[PDB]
UniProtKB/TrEMBL annotation, chains C, D:
<keyword id="KW-1142">T=3 icosahedral capsid protein</keyword>
<feature type="binding site">
    <location>
        <position position="88"/>
    </location>
    <ligand>
        <name>Ca(2+) 1</name>
    </ligand>
</feature>
<dbReference type="GO" id="GO:0039617">
    <property type="term" value="C:T=3 icosahedral viral capsid"/>
</dbReference>
<feature type="binding site">
    <location>
        <position position="83"/>
    </location>
    <ligand>
        <name>Ca(2+) 1</name>
    </ligand>
</feature>
<dbReference type="GO" id="GO:0005198">
    <property type="term" value="F:structural molecule activity"/>
</dbReference>
<keyword id="KW-0479">Metal-binding</keyword>
<feature type="binding site">
    <location>
        <position position="85"/>
    </location>
    <ligand>
        <name>Ca(2+) 1</name>
    </ligand>
</feature>
<keyword id="KW-0167">Capsid protein</keyword>
<comment type="similarity">
    <text>Belongs to the icosahedral plant coat protein family.</text>
</comment>
<keyword id="KW-0946">Virion</keyword>
<feature type="binding site">
    <location>
        <position position="85"/>
    </location>
    <ligand>
        <name>Ca(2+) 2</name>
    </ligand>
</feature>
<feature type="binding site">
    <location>
        <position position="55"/>
    </location>
    <ligand>
        <name>Ca(2+) 2</name>
    </ligand>
</feature>
<feature type="binding site">
    <location>
        <position position="55"/>
    </location>
    <ligand>
        <name>Ca(2+) 1</name>
    </ligand>
</feature>
<feature type="binding site">
    <location>
        <position position="88"/>
    </location>
    <ligand>
        <name>Ca(2+) 2</name>
    </ligand>
</feature>
<feature type="binding site">
    <location>
        <position position="127"/>
    </location>
    <ligand>
        <name>Ca(2+) 2</name>
    </ligand>
</feature>
<keyword id="KW-0106">Calcium</keyword>
<protein>
    <recommendedName>
        <fullName>Capsid protein</fullName>
    </recommendedName>
</protein>
């Protein structure tokens, strides 16, 4: 209760941390608009040593916390009920950072908001500091930013909508530029109040991406993945995720002879059987698996093959007890 | 305005029909319970001549209007937002039948409610008349039934739950036993007010059924299909739907040599490409298509094959612009 | 500085089938295609001849009505609905359309209206370039029918609007330019009178039919080997002029003025035969009946 | 006619990893496995020795607490949540658990509680037969951890309940009967102390470890070719008795009394070698320390 002498001074403890409760969502209707407020987390920030890095990976994949109720990577409970509406408006939203490391962890972190959604995620240390809404902060003290709202209603991303910039409240991000260690530091909570209007039949929750050696990116659906998948001719069909959760996939390739997908030795763990067939001109392989984060080498599938023409996947989110013949 | 003589009598017009408007849903919260009232249709009743028939087909497939917010076959807008909750309660629900044929169409129809959900859908003409809640009626006049509610809260069917009888408000059905012609007659509207409680992460909307020559029915997910798919050894892998809408499928078989799926010549139309590969020991074929009703012979896929061991499908609901390489 | 017109015009007919579910009178539903926008010539038919002389608009109030045409003894359910973004996919079963917030069903022998809510913002008219075509529209309209018991025209739908244009652009015209070859389809240019459906390969195969009403002036060139004459009779649309034609060895050019009612049937409108063909072009304008090629 | 006990006991420890997301201290999460029910011996540890002498229950009030055990310098996030049906699937990423309506996170150096709401209906206790096991439970509890930076036990969780049993049944006991063969798994019978994870094939392979705390009495028979002695040392759990053993040609029977702390490590608890094996059986009871095989 009493800190030892002297008096009236600044004291630095070993750790400070708020304790949180999982409050329920609460609804409210008003003039045909349904209003819902809730709080959940997004991710936990991890730092490197001696290297600038933003959003837990070095490629940093522009977007990826695109603030929009259809985005599953940021909101984890909102988008499965936001697919019943075609318009929204944020009435209040703030990002809360709460630490979970000791005071002896070093490396000053930051989190910030941009208004558009294709500014290519800065690399210089000085370019981070000059956003209009940010918080410089040490990695052991809580920091919160508000992000300003509008009156304009936007759309809730049911189609491809390639100029995905007029329908977004902005973009959220965070970065670290010192350190330290290679541990978790804290986790970012977001609490928010939204509106919805003009109810709709339920849209899909299934991504369909295509990739040949060319146009990247002829995709549709909610971006569980984005254009980060490597194939040229060689032992090259690499898929890796960044969004957490557990998914149901189905793949189809084309070209010369192939091999089996070697998922072992990387992120994400099997849960079923993954039946596979092919090896002459095309092959199909479906699976179901869970994954956690994360940024690392030797990515999550490394389908080799010999000489390839096209590849295309379908991704959908599903629980545990949906796998194959167990 | 004035009917010709005589006066004070009963007059039979050529047709009577109400005109309806597509009212929006409306929400309300109260003590942590979200209350939503809405009206939509289910199907349109079609009759045969000289044969008793119930729910537009002769096999009649027990269940199939199982009154439960997870059932997509009855409610078409409710289940995509009812997958965010684990408990419900109906506060008011009635089924409204509105005619759309002339007075010269004959064959007296009926619709009724049962309290359990495995009574095997009667075949005798006399057994139809003695349900506790029903309406005998001619095919040209509107008839409505209420269905009584409880205070008991039930579950919203996120798992297999093989005794699917304690979690349902009952079962809805309708039948015709005379006629007439082979035309549409009317369509059944349902208006309803529900509650929900104890919000949840969004469950899946994807069915996974399995079938070998044996246990039927080792399934999961929302029953877009039910155990109606024929395979024994021979040119036998037949799938046909009854629920309307448009779907994304993926199939996988096992056994001896096979052939291509001949979807042409029946219900349901192609929309994409349906890539297919296999023909030695197993084969994969996915597709995407829309279908309307309906009960007829030569069912919707007739995958032939030569000698088969297992078959298993995955079904999910998705819009139009999701097909393959167009 | 802002004009303000009020008018009530025709959209299209409706055609039901024997007990299925169709949206906007075709299968596969053609995503979009009735995005409500003053340059969309496929739904308005008097408006876009003056919306080509402007750039912005704002619908101040708009309703869609449905008047009957059939006898009172014909079964049916017609429905009218409106999604507020232009490329959400259209529904595929009759169970889905109860979920739309602005819907109104009814029997095919009675009148049926619905409003559609507006907002005080201004948009653009040009749609040849905007991909996505999503923020330049006020919504998307579609009708659907689900019963028997015939294949006849059982009504039509009319709009009743009020617009506010501003800052005029010069009138480029209303002509189309529809090229086509045995391959990629179809590289249109202009308004959308007609359509990404005109069958032709190499055989007795050069077919064009319409689906919008009105009187028209078309020119067409063909290419390839020997071309036969266009026998327009037997299908929709009636000749009003002279139908001049020339050629038959490498190319054949022919103009026509006619009017079509739109409703369809088998054996489509023009149907040139030819012998072996490469490509075809079409220019379609809307113009009245006095401008006929005299004999 | 209705008894009413109030007690506060232990559930299990918690163990975090270096920056991943784990639920209930394993990967693949074992759907169910903490369904809160007075016969579920895997979470309660004093309650089900008297819930075997009843048939119905009603939790009148129940909360779950979490006390710390680690130093204040260790990073982490622990969380406690509750779904009200027993076989909704467990989440797989840390983003999902913000959506549960009854959740409470916190740092691993501070205390954390959560309530769980009750209702005035009575259920059953027996779970060996009810498929589905869904209406016989009051819910499903699970914890999760998502940070670094160690692999040490960083706390444990305790319940604090109040029950109302009624209409007693006769006490059958608390023994298990775990058969196993090189094939189908595993045909348990009784409470769930332990577990569908006990590795054995034919080689130096007959492994059983526990994950619940407490002191136990186990008997075991084996079959096959030559069996070696169980070398219990080196792993979790310490011997308290004499460990008698016999056999080594076709079968070997051996009893043991011990206690284990539950927390785990490598090199599991018993680990018989053997030479070539067919099947194995286990009977597990919970009993105190005075009943040791004397020397
Ligand atoms: Ca949309
Ligand atoms: Ca559930
Ligand atoms: Ca201009
Ligand atoms: Ca008993």
């Amino acid at each position: 209760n009493q800190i030892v002498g002297g008096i009236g001074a600044i004291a630095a403890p070993v750790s400070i941390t708020k304790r949180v409760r999982g409050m329920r969502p609460s609804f409210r209707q008003t003039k045909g608009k349904v209003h819902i407020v809730h709080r959940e987390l997004v991710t936990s920030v991890i730092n490197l040593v001696g290297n600038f890095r933003v959003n837990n990976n070095v490629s940093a994949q522009i977007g990826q916390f695109r603030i929009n109720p259809s985005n599953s990577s940021l909101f984890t409970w909102l988008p499965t009920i936001a697919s019943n509406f075609d318009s929204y408006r944020f009435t209040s939203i703030r990002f809360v950072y709460v630490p979970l490391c000791a005071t002896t962890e070093t490396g000053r972190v930051s989190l910030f908001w941009d208004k558009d959604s294709q500014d290519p995620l800065p690399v210089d240390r000085a370019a981070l500091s000059s956003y209009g809404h940010s918080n410089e902060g040490p990695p052991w003290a809580e920091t919160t930013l508000n992000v300003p709202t509008d009156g304009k209603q936007r759309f809730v991303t049911d189609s491809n909508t390639t100029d995905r910039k007029l329908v977004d409240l902005g973009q959220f991000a965070f970065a670290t530029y010192a350190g330290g260690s290679n541990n978790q530091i804290g986790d970012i909570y977001v609490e928010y109040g939204v509106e919805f209007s003009e109810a709709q039949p339920a849209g899909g929750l299934t991504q369909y991406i295509t990739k040949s050696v060319g146009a990247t990116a002829s995709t549709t659906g909610p971006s569980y993945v984005v254009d980060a998948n490597i194939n040229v001719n060689a032992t090259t069909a690499n898929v890796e995720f960044f969004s957490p959760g557990t998914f149901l996939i189905t793949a189809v390739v084309y070209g010369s002879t192939i091999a089996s997908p070697s998922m072992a030795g990387g992120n994400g763990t099997l849960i079923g059987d993954l039946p596979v067939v092919g090896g002459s001109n095309a092959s199909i392989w479906t699976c179901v698996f869970s994954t956690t984060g994360v940024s690392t080498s030797v990515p999550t599938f490394t389908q080799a093959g010999t000489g390839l023409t096209r590849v295309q996947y379908t991704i959908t989110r599903v629980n545990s007890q949906t796998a194959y013949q167990v």
